[PDB]
RNA sequence: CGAUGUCGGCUCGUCGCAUCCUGGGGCUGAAGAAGGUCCCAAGGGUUGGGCUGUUCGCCCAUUAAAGCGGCACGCGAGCUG
RNA sequence: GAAUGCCGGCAUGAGUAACGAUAAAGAGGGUGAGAAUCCCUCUCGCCGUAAGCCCAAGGGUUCCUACGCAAUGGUCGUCAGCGUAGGGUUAGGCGGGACCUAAGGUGAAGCCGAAAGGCGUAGCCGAAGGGCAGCCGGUUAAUAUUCCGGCCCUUCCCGCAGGUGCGAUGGGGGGACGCUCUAGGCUAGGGGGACCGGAGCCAUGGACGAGCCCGGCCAGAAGCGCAGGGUGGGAGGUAGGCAAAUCCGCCUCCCAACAAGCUCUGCGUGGUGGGGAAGCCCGGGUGACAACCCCCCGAAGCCAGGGAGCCAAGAAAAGCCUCUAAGCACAACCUGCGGGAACCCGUACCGCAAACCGACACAGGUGGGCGGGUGCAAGAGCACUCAGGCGCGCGGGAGAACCCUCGCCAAGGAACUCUGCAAGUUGGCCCCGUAACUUCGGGAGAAGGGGUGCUCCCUGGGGUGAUGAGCCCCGGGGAGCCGCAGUGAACAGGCUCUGGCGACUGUUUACCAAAAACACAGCUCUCUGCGAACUCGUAAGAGGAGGUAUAGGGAGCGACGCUUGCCCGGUGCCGGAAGGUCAAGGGGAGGGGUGCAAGCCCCGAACCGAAGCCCCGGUGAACGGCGGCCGUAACUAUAACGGUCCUAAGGUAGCGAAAUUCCUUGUCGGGUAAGUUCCGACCUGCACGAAAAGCGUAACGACCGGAGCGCUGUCUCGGCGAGGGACCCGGUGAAAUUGAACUGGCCGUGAAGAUGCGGCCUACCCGUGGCAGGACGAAAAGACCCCGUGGAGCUUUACUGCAGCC
RNA sequence: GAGCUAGCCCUGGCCAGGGUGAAGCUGGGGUGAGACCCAGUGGAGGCCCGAACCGGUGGGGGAUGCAAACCCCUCGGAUGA
RNA sequence: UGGUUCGUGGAGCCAUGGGGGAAUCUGGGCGGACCACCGCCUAAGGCUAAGUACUCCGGGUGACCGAUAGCGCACCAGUAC
RNA sequence: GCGGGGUGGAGCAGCCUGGUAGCUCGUCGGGCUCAUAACCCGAAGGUCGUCGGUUCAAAUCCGGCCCCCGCAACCA
RNA sequence: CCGAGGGUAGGGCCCGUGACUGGGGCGAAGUCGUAACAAGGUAGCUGUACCGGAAGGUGCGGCUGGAU
RNA sequence: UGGGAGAGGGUGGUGGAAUUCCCGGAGUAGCGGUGAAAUGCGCAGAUACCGGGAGGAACGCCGAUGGCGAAGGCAGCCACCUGGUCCACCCGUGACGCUGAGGCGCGAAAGCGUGGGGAGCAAACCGGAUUAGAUACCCGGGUAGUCCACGCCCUAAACG
C-alpha cells in the first residue's frame, strides 16, 4: 500500500530544519540537548 | 416565482430554484469585488469553532454600501439588479450622478432605471434612505442602522422588513423581522420598503449536494454518537434522550434562554419576540 | 485457566448389545396367514427426500428394516462454520 | 542449573521447505582455469493505453570506459546497479533566483499574557498560479533547446537621430478567471494512392505484373495569404475614483456601427538550413543528385481572453497601458538605429522501478504528457501486431498420491448445502415486442423472440472535391454460396414472482462487520436584536460573518402520502416586583476581658440584606407515562351495558406470533409428494403504537427472507485430460520447536485419559513417499470465570471539588 | 509528530466511448385570450452502460506469504456530496 | 492566601492580591488572641568580601574495575545501525 | 428463588400502632307510578383463607399448610 | 410461398372458487340507551368536518319541510 | 343616440364604534357565571373608572315585505377598472332567431396544499355542573378553522 514515509525535501527542512528548531524554545532545547550529547548532526540532512 | 423541475431524476423531483426574473446583469463590478477568505469554520487558532462547514462554491465579496449617508442629497440611478452569493437578498447596482458606483441590497418593487436618493430631504419612496425620524409612522422599512452612523444592521435578509410603530423622544419604535419591539435611535438610517426576493424561503434544495454547494457539510446528530462525544451518545440500539435534550457541550437546548439579562440594550427592548 | 478449541454437519470408521431387519427358538386368548410376548444370536444389513443450525423430532415415498448407544455429547495439526 | 533470565557461541528440525508471478525456450559460434546463466548469430515466445517513450517527486554517481570475482546476486558467473581506477553533467532564451502575489507564515505600528509566550494592519516571506526572451539539425564512450551549424529573439548600459510635458511604490484601465455544451478555420496525428525515388526479388504449382518490399519530410525571420482574438470615434460639463489629472466614472451632443479601420495571436507560404528507407558491405559506409507530390480521415490540441445555456455565481498581485504629484524641463521619457554588457543555482544516471516508498534486485504503492496500425457499432475496451522492450537470476528429468489453476463429461438436473456457496446459463449491435403498479419520470435492457458470414447485381442520401471522377461516412431492395456453428476468435447482463428493512446518489469500523448503521433533502421544537447566541483562547484575538430572524447556533425526526391521541402530580424548561427561608455586609438590645482611669480589645439578639430553593402558574415534535378485580344478552360462547378500587392520566388511529410472540413448529389458508422457513389471515400484543414517530408507498439496493423458470460436476458419483508444485538428479539452503531419550499394543494402576509403573502380549537393524489418531502435539504467562482493598473508559438525582454561568 | 491517516484552506490537474432525451426555443393545432396537445429543435441530470481513475461485494488461493492486508475470478461508483 | 513546627487553632510573627487608611520620637514595630505594667527594637532606599556549594577542566591517591568488568565508547562512539 | 395478597353477595377500608370491622354497590321490606327504572324511608348479611402459638384479649402480632395474582432465572 | 395445428412467451375479458374480512336483508315476545314524530322535553332537516358504546353530538354555512 | 336605478364583479386605499391584550393612573373585596351553582379570575391588587398603545375581524342607525346577479351569492366610506339591465327617440341591419346531447366556465359552507395572519368566535380537547349514566344540552377555558394570497375540492333543503 502507500506507506508512512514519503520523502519530500521541502517538508523535511521546514519541519526539522535548523531554522525551524531555533524559533521554538523546545526546538532550541533539542539543539542544546543534541549538542551536549555530541551528535554529529543536530538536524536531519536534507539537500535543499 | 420559483422554478420547478420534472422528476427526471429522484432529487429533481422536489428541487426548486430561483426564477432570477429581476436579474439584469450577470457579472459583477470589478472595482467592487474583493476576494472572500473562506474559513472552513476555522478560527485563527486553526480550530473548528463552527461545525459542519466548508467545501462550497468559490465566491467574490461584493462590497455593499450599508452607510448611505455618505452621499446625502446626491441622487443615483438604478443601473442593474445583480446576483450576490453572500446574502439571501439581491443587490442593486447604482451609478450615482457623481460618477461613483456602489452596491445596495435591493428592496422589493425596485425597478431598474429608477432614481434613488438618501437624506432627510428624501422622498418616502422605495429605495430611499432617511434617518428614521423623518419617515412617516407606519411605513415598511429595511437596512436599518442599529446605532447612528454605525452601519445598517437590521432587515437585510430576503423578504424582510421592519415597520415603524411610533415615536418617543430621540428614539423611534420599530417592529423587527423577529417581531421584537425595539427602541432604535432617531438619527439611525433606514431604507424604505422591504428587501426583495421574498420567494427565497420557498426554495427546496432537493438533495444533499445542493447543501454541499452552499458550503454546508453534513450535520451529524448527537444521538448517533458516543458518550465521549455527546450527551446523547451511547446506548444499545436506538435510545431516547435520557436527560434533558442537550448540546455537545452540555447546555440545555429546549427552551433555555441564553441572552445576558444585564445587557445594556435591555433598556431598549420593549417586547420580546413573537412566535 | 505459562490454553484439554466448545454444538451441529461432512468424511472415515470401530466397539457394545439392552436385537430394528435377516437366522434359530419356547409360550400364546397360535385354525391358516398375519401378529403379541419372551429366549438365543452382533455375521451382515439398516433408503432417498420436505422443514429447522439444529441433535432430536414431525411429515413425504419406499423398505426385510428404516435399532439404540460408547469411542474427549468419536473424529476442526481431516474439512465445514 | 533452572528466573518463557541477560549476552554470546554452537546444535536440532535437514540435506528437509524454499530459491518471489506458468511470458518459454533451443542450437551454433566466441571468451575463459572454469559457462544452462557473460558476448555474438539464427530459431521460438512474451508486453505494445506497455512490460515502449518523454517529464516531475524522490534517490544521490547508481552514468561511461578499463581492469577484477572475496563478499553482495536467492544457482552459476568470465557478468553486474558489486570491488578498484580514470573519465563524464557546459545555457542571457529550459527550470529556479536577482519578478509578482495565494492559502499560510512572519510581522515597524498596536494589543494581550506569571516567565517562556499568544495575537496583529501595513509591509515582507511564500507557487506546480500570473509574468517572461529558442526552434530544427549534427556531434561524445558518457552532455546538449546548454557545445557546434543555420535562422531568430530578450533585458540592461552608453551613444546617435526623430518625437513628446517628461516624471510614481500615487490615480485609473488591464491583468482577471466558473460548470456544461459547442461554431468556424487550422495544426498534431493517421490511412491511401495506377504518382515519385529505391538496393534487390520471381521461390514450391502460378505471377516481369498498374506484382512484391521500402521511403515519399522537418525547422524557418520580414513580407504576403487564410482564420480568428482584442478595441468604438469626436466635443461640452463634471461636485466621484481620500492631493492632482487632459486618465477612468457619470450626464449631454455629433458621427458610425456582426463592416471597416487599428493592433495581437495561430496556421500557411517563405531567403535558408537540415534530415533521408528498406536491402548487403565491415555504430558506420552504400542506396542517393534519394524522392520529397496528390487524395482522404482528423483532434480532447491551436486561433482562445471564441460562442451559447445554466446556477452553486466562479483568486490576487506585478509585468504592461494611461493620468498626473513633488520634481524637472543642459534633464526626463517614447521610437528606430548602433556598439557594448548579460550573474548565481540545477543539468550525469534510475524514474510504474533491481536505482523512489515498502528491513530484500519484495507479484504491493507512486503525479503529469506521448501512446502507432487492423479488425470487432464506438472506445484509451478486446485480440493480434509496429517502433521499442523484454522471456521475470537455479536448472535437468519424471509423468505417483495429493494441492492449486484449468478443459470435457453419459442419464438425471439443486436430489448438494445453512445458502445454487461456487460454477453453468445470459451475454455486443440491429429489428420486432414488452405486464402489475406508478410520484406518469419510470418499471424497461422488463419479459420474449427474430437478424448477424461471404459472392454477385440494382439503387438511395451525406462530407470532401466543383455541381463531377476519385477517396470517405450513412443506408435500402433482389438473386445466390458455405459450414456443426457467421458479435464463427478475444472482450460484453441469467431471468421472473413475492416479502422485510432503508426513500433515493452517497458514507462508514486503514488491516475479520459496507449493513437495516451515519449522512441526506424535508418536518418540528428551541435559542439568538448583533459587541448576537453559541465555539476556541488566561487574555488579546478570532471563528459566527465582512452575515443580520427568509439569518446564525443547538436538538430530535429523516423523500413523499394519510396522520401524530389522553396525562403537567415528579424532573427539566418558561413566566411570577407577593410570602417563606437565605451569605458576606449593615445594624449593635445586651453581655465579656484588661486598666486607677480616660481607653484599647472581644462576643453579640432584634431588625434591614441577592441569586438559589421553597411556593403560584404555563409547557410533550420537553425528561417521561399512558390500570385492576367482579358481574351482565330468550341455547351455549362472548360481553355493546353495569358495579367498584386505584391513578397525573389509563394506549386513541393505524398495525400486530412482527428485525417485537415466552408458551411456539400458536390456529386456519396458500404454495410443496412432504414447508420449525415463506406469504395471507385470526388476535389473551410474555413485552407494537404514533417525530427514540405510527401505517403505507413508485423508483432505487454487491443489504436479509420465500419461490419459480433457465442452466449446470453442487449432488447421485465419480471418470479422464492439461499445465504449475509434490517426486528423482546437480546447485544453494531456512524455520518455529527441542530437559534428556535406548520414544510399541492391551487390561490395569497412578494427581482421576501412561512410550516411561504392574502383568501380559507383541516386536530383527535402518530409511523413503504418504495419512493425521496420540505425544493431554505447536503457537499465545486463557481474551471466558473468579481473585486483587490492581488499572483504565463510560455514566449518574454516588462523594468532593473545578471551569463556566447566576 | 498531520511526509501515514481524518477534516478544512490555497493553487493546479484528470474523467475513453456509447445511451437516455428535462426545461427552453420554433413551427403546427387550439381558444376571446389561455392553459394545453402535436412535431422538430435542443442537450438537462448526486440520469443509464462502461475503460482510465476511486473502490473493495461474493468466492477461491495465500497464511515461517510475492505481501506485518497480497494474488485470481467476480462485483460498486464512474459530471459528482 | 502564602511562609514558619503551626492543617483555623487561643494564631501572634514575616510576606501581600482587595477595601479603608495615619503619624515623625510625647513617633512607631515587637515580646504568640487581647489589656495593663516591664522591656527589646527603629519599617516602608541600596551595597557589602571571607567562611559555604558544585566539577566541564589539571593533578594526586585507592583493602576501585581489569575488555559481558570499568564511562554508553580502552579500538575512528554518541559512531554504525 | 424473592414480593404483594386471602375479611357480609361484588369491589375496596380497618392491620403499620392488639381491645372499637367501615365505604360504595348489591339483596330484602315500605313508599312514588297505571306500571317499571330512577328516587325516597328503614332493614338484614362478614364472624376476618385454615391450623398452632403470643396475649387478659388477635381480622391486627409471630410460625406452618393451602390457595391467588406479581418479579426473577444472568457469565458460560 | 401459404398452410390445419402443435409448441414456447407474454397480455385481455368472463366464470367458478378461497382462510378471512366488510357491511346488507330477513328472523312473535333478546341486551343497552331514547335519536326522531307534540316546542318530542336542546326545533328539525341538511352538505361538510371532527368526535363518541350506540342511536347521536358539536362546529360552519344553508333550507323551513319550524317557531305558535 | 341620449338618459336612470342598483350590497352586480375586481383592484387599491381609508373611517369610527365594540371585544381582547399591553402600559400608566386612581381605587378595593370581590368579579364572573347559572335554573341554582361550581370550575375559573382576584390582596402577587382583580372586577368596575380614566388616559395611552397594538392588533384582527365585522360594518351599527340608514335597512325595507327593499335593491343587484344566471345561480352560488353581494352591505362602512373613497377612487379606478368592469358586467348585466330598464326606459325613451323610432335612426341603422334585415329572420341574423329559439333551444341545447358533449365541451367549457362559474359554483355557499366545510375541507385540502404552500405561505401569511390570528382580536373575537370555536369542531377536537380539558375542566366544572346536571344526571342512573351525560363521550350531550348549561358554565370556565381551548386547537384547527373562521381572515388574506395563490392553487385545489365541485357538494347542498345550490328551493320558487
Ligand atoms: K462472558
Ligand atoms: Mg486500498
Ligand atoms: Mg492511491
Ligand atoms: Mg520538495
Ligand atoms: Mg511540502
Ligand atoms: Mg525550517
Ligand atoms: Mg565528525
Ligand atoms: Mg532536529
Ligand atoms: Mg422539482
Ligand atoms: Mg431574482
Ligand atoms: Mg482589483
Ligand atoms: Mg496564525
Ligand atoms: Mg499550532
Ligand atoms: Mg457550532
Ligand atoms: Mg467546520
Ligand atoms: Mg442575492
Ligand atoms: Mg456556496
Ligand atoms: Mg444528521
Ligand atoms: Mg454508535
Ligand atoms: Mg476525543
Ligand atoms: Mg457526556
Ligand atoms: Mg442517551
Ligand atoms: Mg458501541
Ligand atoms: Mg445509540
Ligand atoms: Mg432498545
Ligand atoms: Mg425520546
Ligand atoms: Mg451557556
Ligand atoms: Mg425578541
Ligand atoms: Mg482451563
Ligand atoms: Mg497446547
Ligand atoms: Mg429385544
Ligand atoms: Mg402364524
Ligand atoms: Mg385367527
Ligand atoms: Mg449383527
Ligand atoms: Mg434435522
Ligand atoms: Mg425439534
Ligand atoms: Mg416381515
Ligand atoms: Mg455429555
Ligand atoms: Mg465431541
Ligand atoms: Mg467441529
Ligand atoms: Mg491434536
Ligand atoms: Mg536451583
Ligand atoms: Mg524462548
Ligand atoms: Mg539460563
Ligand atoms: Mg548434535
Ligand atoms: Mg533428498
Ligand atoms: Mg520431513
Ligand atoms: Mg523443492
Ligand atoms: Mg524469481
Ligand atoms: Mg513462492
Ligand atoms: Mg502463449
Ligand atoms: Mg578468466
Ligand atoms: Mg536463467
Ligand atoms: Mg496499440
Ligand atoms: Mg536507497
Ligand atoms: Mg563473486
Ligand atoms: Mg550472494
Ligand atoms: Mg555466487
Ligand atoms: Mg545560448
Ligand atoms: Mg544587480
Ligand atoms: Mg513579494
Ligand atoms: Mg507570530
Ligand atoms: Mg517570491
Ligand atoms: Mg513561479
Ligand atoms: Mg488561474
Ligand atoms: Mg525562463
Ligand atoms: Mg525560434
Ligand atoms: Mg535627441
Ligand atoms: Mg508619447
Ligand atoms: Mg506625462
Ligand atoms: Mg475577477
Ligand atoms: Mg452546472
Ligand atoms: Mg470544428
Ligand atoms: Mg507544425
Ligand atoms: Mg486512418
Ligand atoms: Mg503512403
Ligand atoms: Mg514455380
Ligand atoms: Mg474633477
Ligand atoms: Mg481629485
Ligand atoms: Mg475636460
Ligand atoms: Mg543514411
Ligand atoms: Mg553521397
Ligand atoms: Mg467566453
Ligand atoms: Mg492581496
Ligand atoms: Mg513645484
Ligand atoms: Mg536646465
Ligand atoms: Mg549577483
Ligand atoms: Mg543534461
Ligand atoms: Mg507513468
Ligand atoms: Mg531498473
Ligand atoms: Mg519503515
Ligand atoms: Mg529478481
Ligand atoms: Mg516491485
Ligand atoms: Mg526495494
Ligand atoms: Mg491516440
Ligand atoms: Mg466494439
Ligand atoms: Mg516422478
Ligand atoms: Mg453431465
Ligand atoms: Mg431444473
Ligand atoms: Mg430441466
Ligand atoms: Mg440435505
Ligand atoms: Mg436462500
Ligand atoms: Mg453465485
Ligand atoms: Mg459474450
Ligand atoms: Mg405510466
Ligand atoms: Mg431482449
Ligand atoms: Mg466464409
Ligand atoms: Mg452488463
Ligand atoms: Mg418475516
Ligand atoms: Mg440506503
Ligand atoms: Mg418512504
Ligand atoms: Mg433517507
Ligand atoms: Mg474493517
Ligand atoms: Mg489494523
Ligand atoms: Mg481496525
Ligand atoms: Mg475481508
Ligand atoms: Mg453497498
Ligand atoms: Mg467486507
Ligand atoms: Mg441515518
Ligand atoms: Mg418530512
Ligand atoms: Mg471554552
Ligand atoms: Mg473562556
Ligand atoms: Mg468577517
Ligand atoms: Mg433515526
Ligand atoms: Mg399513495
Ligand atoms: Mg407531566
Ligand atoms: Mg411539570
Ligand atoms: Mg405543573
Ligand atoms: Mg430572593
Ligand atoms: Mg406524542
Ligand atoms: Mg349469558
Ligand atoms: Mg401496551
Ligand atoms: Mg385517545
Ligand atoms: Mg398475532
Ligand atoms: Mg407461523
Ligand atoms: Mg414485543
Ligand atoms: Mg416461538
Ligand atoms: Mg407448523
Ligand atoms: Mg397446502
Ligand atoms: Mg432451508
Ligand atoms: Mg403472517
Ligand atoms: Mg390468542
Ligand atoms: Mg416518541
Ligand atoms: Mg415500499
Ligand atoms: Mg446494499
Ligand atoms: Mg469435481
Ligand atoms: Mg499434470
Ligand atoms: Mg549461496
Ligand atoms: Mg497386543
Ligand atoms: Mg491408562
Ligand atoms: Mg515400581
Ligand atoms: Mg512391564
Ligand atoms: Mg497425528
Ligand atoms: Mg508476564
Ligand atoms: Mg494466567
Ligand atoms: Mg478482545
Ligand atoms: Mg492473554
Ligand atoms: Mg471462575
Ligand atoms: Mg474493598
Ligand atoms: Mg484484600
Ligand atoms: Mg496532510
Ligand atoms: Mg446528457
Ligand atoms: Mg451518474
Ligand atoms: Mg488520461
Ligand atoms: Mg463467485
Ligand atoms: Mg494476514
Ligand atoms: Mg488482487
Ligand atoms: Mg457504471
Ligand atoms: Mg484539622
Ligand atoms: Mg488546630
Ligand atoms: Mg498563625
Ligand atoms: Mg506611638
Ligand atoms: Mg510590622
Ligand atoms: Mg520579639
Ligand atoms: Mg505574651
Ligand atoms: Mg526585638
Ligand atoms: Mg526609619
Ligand atoms: Mg561568600
Ligand atoms: Mg582484579
Ligand atoms: Mg579476555
Ligand atoms: Mg571517555
Ligand atoms: Mg395499614
Ligand atoms: Mg388497631
Ligand atoms: Mg378484635
Ligand atoms: Mg288501563
Ligand atoms: Mg401436429
Ligand atoms: Mg336532536
Ligand atoms: Mg327525544
Ligand atoms: Mg328535540
Ligand atoms: Mg332530551
Ligand atoms: Mg365505551
Ligand atoms: Mg362534543
Ligand atoms: Mg312542524
Ligand atoms: Mg400586600
Ligand atoms: Mg332595407
Ligand atoms: Mg365550491
Ligand atoms: Mg374534504
Ligand atoms: Mg391533506
Ligand atoms: Mg371562550
From Swiss-Prot, chain A:
User: Where is region (Disordered) located?
Assistant: 26-48
Query: Per the UniProt entry, what is one GO biological process?
Result: translation
Entry keyword set = Ribonucleoprotein, Ribosomal protein
Give the free-text miscellaneous remark of the entry: The open reading frame (ORF) for this protein is entirely within the ORF for the RNase P protein (RnaP). The two start codons are separated by four nucleotides.
Give the compositionally biased regions (Basic residues).
Answer: 29-48
Instruction: Give the organism the record lists.
Output: Thermus thermophilus (strain ATCC 27634 / DSM 579 / HB8)
Q: Tell me the function of this protein.
A: Found on the solvent side of the large subunit.
Provide the leader sequence positions.
Answer: none
- Tell whether Ribonucleoprotein is among the UniProt keywords: yes
**GO CC annotations?**
ribonucleoprotein complex; ribosome
Q: What is this protein called?
A: Large ribosomal subunit protein bL34
What is the annotated quaternary arrangement, including any partners?
Part of the 50S ribosomal subunit.
Swiss-Prot record, chain B:
Basic residues compositional bias, start-end:
256-275
Q: Has the keyword Nucleotide-binding been applied to this entry?
A: no
Q: Please list the GO biological process terms of this entry.
A: cytoplasmic translation
SMART domains documented for this protein: Ribosomal_L2, Ribosomal_L2_C
Q: InterPro entries from the xrefs?
A: NA-bd_OB-fold (IPR012340), Rib_uL2_dom2 (IPR014722), Ribosomal_uL2 (IPR002171), Ribosomal_uL2_bac/org-type (IPR005880), Ribosomal_uL2_C (IPR022669), Ribosomal_uL2_CS (IPR022671), Ribosomal_uL2_dom3 (IPR014726), Ribosomal_uL2_RNA-bd_dom (IPR022666)
What Gene Ontology terms describe where this protein resides (cellular component)?
large ribosomal subunit
Q: Cross-referenced Pfam families, in alphabetical order?
A: Ribosomal_L2, Ribosomal_L2_C
**PANTHER family annotated for this entry?**
LARGE RIBOSOMAL SUBUNIT PROTEIN UL2M, RIBOSOMAL PROTEIN L2
How does it associate, per the subunit comment?
Part of the 50S ribosomal subunit. Forms a bridge to the 30S subunit in the 70S ribosome, contacting the 16S rRNA. May also make transient contacts with protein S6 during translation in the 70S ribosome.
- Family the entry assigns: Belongs to the universal ribosomal protein uL2 family.
Q: What does this protein do?
A: One of the primary rRNA binding proteins. Required for association of the 30S and 50S subunits to form the 70S ribosome, for tRNA binding and peptide bond formation. It has been suggested to have peptidyltransferase activity; this is somewhat controversial. Makes several contacts with the 16S rRNA (forming bridge B7b) in the 70S ribosome.
From the Swiss-Prot or TrEMBL record, give the protein name. Answer: Large ribosomal subunit protein uL2
Amino acid at each position: 500500500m502507500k506507506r508512512t514515509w514519503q520523502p519530500n525535501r521541502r517538508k523535511r527542512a521546514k519541519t526539522h530544519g535548523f531554522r525551524a528548531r531555533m524559533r521554538t524554545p523546545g526546538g532550541r532545547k533539542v539543539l542544546k540537548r543534541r549538542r551536549q550529547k555530541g551528535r554529529w548532526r543536530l538536524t536531519p540532512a536534507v539537500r535543499k | 416565482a420559483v422554478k420547478k423541475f420534472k422528476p427526471y431524476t429522484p432529487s429533481r423531483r422536489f428541487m426548486t430554484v430561483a426564477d432570477f426574473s429581476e436579474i439584469t446583469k450577470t457579472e459583477p463590478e470589478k472595482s467592487l469585488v474583493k476576494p472572500l477568505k473562506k474559513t472552513g469554520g476555522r478560527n485563527n487558532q486553526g480550530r473548528i469553532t463552527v461545525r459542519f462547514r466548508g467545501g462550497g462554491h468559490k465566491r467574490l465579496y461584493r462590497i455593499i454600501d450599508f452607510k448611505r449617508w455618505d452621499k446625502v442629497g446626491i441622487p443615483a440611478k438604478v443601473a442593474a439588479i445583480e446576483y450576490d452569493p453572500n446574502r439571501s437578498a439581491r443587490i442593486a447596482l447604482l451609478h450615482y450622478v457623481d460618477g461613483e458606483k456602489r452596491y445596495i441590497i435591493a428592496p422589493d418593487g425596485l425597478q431598474v432605471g429608477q432614481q434613488v436618493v438618501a437624506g432627510p430631504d428624501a422622498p418616502i419612496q422605495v429605495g430611499n434612505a432617511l434617518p428614521l425620524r423623518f419617515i412617516p409612522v407606519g411605513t415598511v422599512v429595511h437596512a436599518v442602522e442599529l446605532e447612528p452612523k454605525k452601519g445598517a444592521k437590521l432587515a437585510r435578509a430576503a423578504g424582510t422588513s421592519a415597520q415603524i410603530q411610533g415615536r418617543e423622544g430621540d428614539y423611534v419604535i420599530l417592529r423587527l423581522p423577529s417581531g421584537e419591539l425595539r427602541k432604535v435611535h432617531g438619527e439611525c438610517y433606514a431604507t424604505v420598503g422591504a428587501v426583495g426576493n421574498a420567494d427565497h424561503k420557498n426554495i427546496v434544495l432537493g438533495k444533499a449536494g445542493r447543501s454541499r454547494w452552499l458550503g454546508r457539510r453534513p450535520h451529524v446528530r448527537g444521538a448517533a454518537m458516543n458518550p465521549v462525544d455527546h450527551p446523547h451518545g451511547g446506548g444499545e440500539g436506538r435510545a431516547p434522550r435520557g436527560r434533558p435534550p442537550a448540546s455537545p457541550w452540555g447546555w440545555q437546548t429546549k427552551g433555555l434562554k441564553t441572552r445576558k439579562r444585564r445587557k445594556p440594550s435591555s433598556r431598549f427592548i420593549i417586547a420580546r419576540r413573537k412566535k
